[PDB]
Design a binder for this molecule. Structure first.
Ligand code: NAD
Ligand code: NAD
Ligand code: NAD
Ligand code: NAD
Lengths: 333, 312, 340, 335
């Protein structure tokens, strides 16, 4: 594997692959590309303000990072086609930059000689978007450029998939109360894209924000195609998010009935977990699920024949999503 | 006018009454010196542009004396302590306005929704919660125009003084209220939806909802997801609700794509935000999302003071 | 057949002390915790032990009963007696020794209550006056004797400053010093501006959105830990908007003319194999020390010597996890104090 | 009227615009940045630190409109190609981009036809560094490119100047407990310059950080050249900072004596204020002083003949420093 973008997702992908050890023996990272010195990349891998200090020996050379006696070549090629990692025997590209979020853009990795590309984000409606343990089965040996979806997609998908299987979703709306991310502003100022809300200080604001996670969920769950919409509120934490789903269902239900039906689909599920301890956002930081169902927030509102059903799942939008991406990575082998 | 509880709401009530009626005395659990200091210097709302000092038994603002008591039992009124949230408790205090929900056995007033149910016989009145003053007008005018069959609310809400600075024992013993407010999204109860029946009787039993407490000092928004009687578009929802904001000092309007800190210091109980309106349709099934911002401190406080002035 | 601990105050320090004793396992075998006292339900105490916003989720089986907390099949009786003298844990649970972590018994006279309830010994998780021993493990744990009944583990700042000042003074001689600790907010601070116990104008202010100047006795009282520095240091804190992780800056006039390299090499040698006084030259920031087991971590990258002829100021800096770092120091002092 | 072009409509640039607007025979006529006028108008109107501008703010395709007055917005990354002198009559450029932090770079504004340039940062040793009400008197009619120093320089300079005047500073060290700034990272990641500490999430860290404010204070107070060093701790608030100074003085002093001596130099001083109410960082947000002396934190440590003196001053590193720069801009008109 070649990692393009050794950012939050790229470095956590590296940590996840490393900590899996033998359960990841079928893959091996060999090289990294970013816009930065190997010295700083080694430093950021080692010391993480959100996830703590890597329990491993981390150093840098003029052109690489060294972890536990193993050399990882670092390039600084802004153009994906000019990365010569295919010098390192790269077969697949983990595309984590946010600048190649297209079949047409990620084509560059296939030009540099990659077999396959997995993009760490939504990447259009014209390729497969995989949420592991929802639709990883649509993957075939012909697939060259695949989206691992967004963090919100990996949280919403299993909640919606199993809720719809059990009760039938006619229509739903989503709000994700979502940790701030690296595209946001530390202080009010000019932001790429020019968005009036993305421009605002992330740490001291609730910021309404677009996600396609609901609108595009059709790519992951065809039966929900065109049935969901939603948006995010970016709030003042570094990591840890929850998705609220409000839906009209086919079936009349109670909260207990919704919770027992969804919970059964979490039994032994490493992608879609369960928690009824009344956790809060920081409790999911470092968890390995893409989605954690929280029955304690389930709410069914009924007046005669009209019924609204609220369900909620937590997610570590960094490490939780990353563990989903790595599961999807391993399946590509 | 006696302010019981010179806290966030009590001190902002004092600032609001001053900047506009007159306060004559204050009760809390603290020295006059600290109360004068907290009135003067406010981490959320800035420095009071007035001369503030203390004596051994009072606060002085612009040459005017405001007597300070430290009596825990009110049996020794703007009730802002959070410890007298009942007709029975507030009995201790001509009239009492409680700065919070206070049960189903007295009137709960959201100014510019139901302040007209007030009569000269009313002695103990609830000004409702901050969330009630935000939700009420959004639900009232949305229901008037389109008919709400059923709705759920989520308020993305600033942390408040009942929450914990760091994980620890909290009064009430709630597992979530116990957790560090500044570094958590914390699911949290509000009665604002379930009890909205007290303010808007026809929405009784039609709404539920809850809060997510998030890591800002002040400034909140309410999301309402509803099944309506009428098929609508976002533009149609926004134009219909917006007309009810024209000249409305309690229910304002903003389409500039603001964020939470922009409402800090605003005088509305509720600010409709058309930019977040969302209609989801598959055949005959339709969900409508509407959103209103609120300064849960100063916005709610300006609502309480409007309700206070109507008592004269 | 070991010394049985009652924890009074299952707060930040109390719960982390419990986690530290648990994770030490056999290295803590000559201690065992049997009982807890606080102002709350066992259900909430078990919840707070399990889920920690700063230090993460306890890798253990945690539950509650009507009157206790259960960790890994082991029962820990929970009382809710606000008066230390009325905690029946001596007769009920066999408590030898009280770990006093409430902040409300921060005196020989107040902590006397535990000796009245029948405890042999009390270790206070804070400064507790100038009339009992204040121990910083690996500076002065040697002044402990079997006669000692009520002992202070010092403050977090004391456990950070003490070794930095002790070894700096040993190598160069401190004539005079001032300290500033840039310190995480703590549970005594306010979430939003308002009335605070003690009435302090600064402690009253919203902790998350302010730099708040604040008293520490850590410098003034450092004499209790290091007699030769007695009356030579003063200092104060700036409380800043993080949940945990602090650093102490020491500015001193030394006997010796020095360079930064010379100060760093001399102090560093006293960190070799030192479980209490660690070393880090990776250019870390506050969050990097959250969960570290040192009371103090020397940071040579911040060392600064300012010279104009014969006038010289030396700035040295050490990080500390004011929660878990200090707690690991308190537990080291606990394991010695009980085994005396 | 004094006619101003703002280059860089960032934190400092937008606050400079607010300050000049609220003031006095000074007027902004044009703005240059790398963004839409729509977003610039939005950020001027709504400020997460300083609140909502009490004025009517709108945008056109090429300008910002405030209270029926048009302010042309350019998007020229090269200072020499900003046509604001011929188009808008710009006299003085307020350089607030961070990318022209040199006599040689800011020369570009003089090439585009500007009379003078004031740079909102340290800008080297080969032009004057002015802290208003310390050394604004060294300005002459020949000075065309001037540094306003840093926020920390405007806080430290008066504290050190008046402390040294009264007692003589032999040697000092500074720590500024400083709000996070726009160069810092919202989350751990690659940062320009590659600094291991500047790379770290600003909102959840105390981050040790360089300032030249002490080492280069020689530019403002020549006699303290080589006598001071120091550094910053970047902490998790949006704005509001304090400078601690620890010094060996010529004179034996008490805290009361230090406080009375320094306080005298704050009387009527619009640049170097006084506050003994036991304030905290947020209380200085929106204040107009470059420095606010806080006697409550004064500390003298003595053993025999060895004495350390700790003094402290607060500063709104945004609006306080900005009010200092606008003061230096108005003095430019008297030249
Ligand atoms: N952070 C999350 O919660 C999260 C989770 C799921 C999806 N994602 C997606 O993953 C991607 C990465 O986001 P992130 O949070 O890691 O951001 P980040 O800014 O931390 O990571 C981006 C990294 O890519 C590097 N980079 C940028 N342009 C490059 C180029 N042209 N060539 C090489 N390297 C380049 C940057 O220097 C940086 O290190 C985005 O597409 C994002 O939407 C993020
Ligand atoms: N802050 C908000 O967003 C908001 C908005 C609407 C309503 N409210 C309600 O207003 C009330 C006050 O909340 P707040 O945010 O001002 O909190 P706060 O804690 O700052 O104010 C409460 C004040 O009352 C004092 N007090 C406590 N017990 C007392 C007693 N027995 N006698 C006298 N004084 C006593 C406290 O010392 C404190 O000064 C609560 O009911 C709250 O639910 C809060
Ligand atoms: N937090 C730090 O960084 C730190 C570091 C070292 C020292 N300390 C000291 O440790 C002590 C505790 O501080 P903390 O941060 O753990 O605070 P905390 O508020 O989290 O813990 C105090 C606990 O004691 C309980 N309590 C209070 N009064 C009680 C009583 N009368 N009886 C029983 N339980 C009672 C409270 O309910 C709470 O659970 C203080 O003396 C503090 O100064 C704190
Ligand atoms: N923020 C503070 O506390 C503070 C205080 C004193 C000094 N300063 C200095 O002020 C300057 C600006 O700092 P800031 O915090 O306002 O930063 P900022 O990022 O908020 O502002 C910089 C602005 O300049 C614009 N810009 C960048 N390059 C440009 C170019 N070539 N042409 C035109 N516009 C360009 C950017 O779009 C942005 O709007 C820096 O030199 C900084 O060191 C900052």
């Amino acid at each position: 594997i070649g990692i393009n973008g050794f950012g939050r997702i790229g470095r956590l992908a590296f940590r996840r692959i490393l900590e899996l050890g033998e359960k990841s023996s079928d893959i091996e990272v060999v090289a990294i590309n970013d816009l930065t010195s190997p010295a700083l990349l080694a430093h950021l891998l080692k010391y993480d303000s959100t996830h703590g200090t890597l329990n491993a020996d981390v150093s840098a050379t003029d052109d690489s990072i060294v972890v536990n006696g193993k050399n990882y070549r670092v390039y600084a090629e802004p153009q994906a086609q000019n990365i010569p990692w295919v010098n390192d025997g790269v077969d697949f590209v983990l595309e984590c930059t946010g600048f190649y979020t297209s079949k047409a853009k990620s084509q560059a990795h296939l030009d540099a000689g990659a077999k396959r590309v997995l993009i760490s984000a939504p990447a259009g409606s014209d390729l497969k978007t995989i949420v592991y343990n929802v639709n990883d089965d649509i993957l075939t040996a012909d697939d060259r450029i695949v989206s691992a979806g967004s963090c919100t997609t990996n949280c919403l998908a299993p909640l919606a998939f199993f809720e719809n299987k059990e009760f039938g979703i006619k229509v739903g709306t989503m709000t994700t109360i979502h940790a701030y991310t690296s595209t946001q502003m530390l202080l009010d100022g000019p932001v790429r894209g020019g968005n009036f809300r993305a421009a605002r200080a992330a740490g001291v604001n609730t910021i309404p924000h677009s996600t396609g996670a609901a609108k595009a969920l059709g790519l992951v769950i065809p039966e929900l195609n065109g049935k969901l919409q939603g948006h995010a509120q970016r709030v003042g934490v570094v990591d840890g998010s929850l998705t609220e789903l409000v839906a009209i269902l086919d079936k009349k239900v109670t909260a207990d009935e919704v919770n027992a039906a969804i919970k059964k689909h979490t039994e032994g599920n490493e992608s879609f977990g369960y928690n009824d301890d009344e956790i809060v956002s920081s409790d999911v930081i470092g968890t390995t699920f893409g989605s954690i169902f929280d029955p304690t927030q389930t709410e069914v509102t009924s007046d005669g024949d009209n019924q609204l059903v609220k369900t909620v799942a937590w997610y570590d939008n960094e490490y939780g999503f990353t563990c989903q991406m790595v599961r999807t990575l391993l399946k590509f082998a």
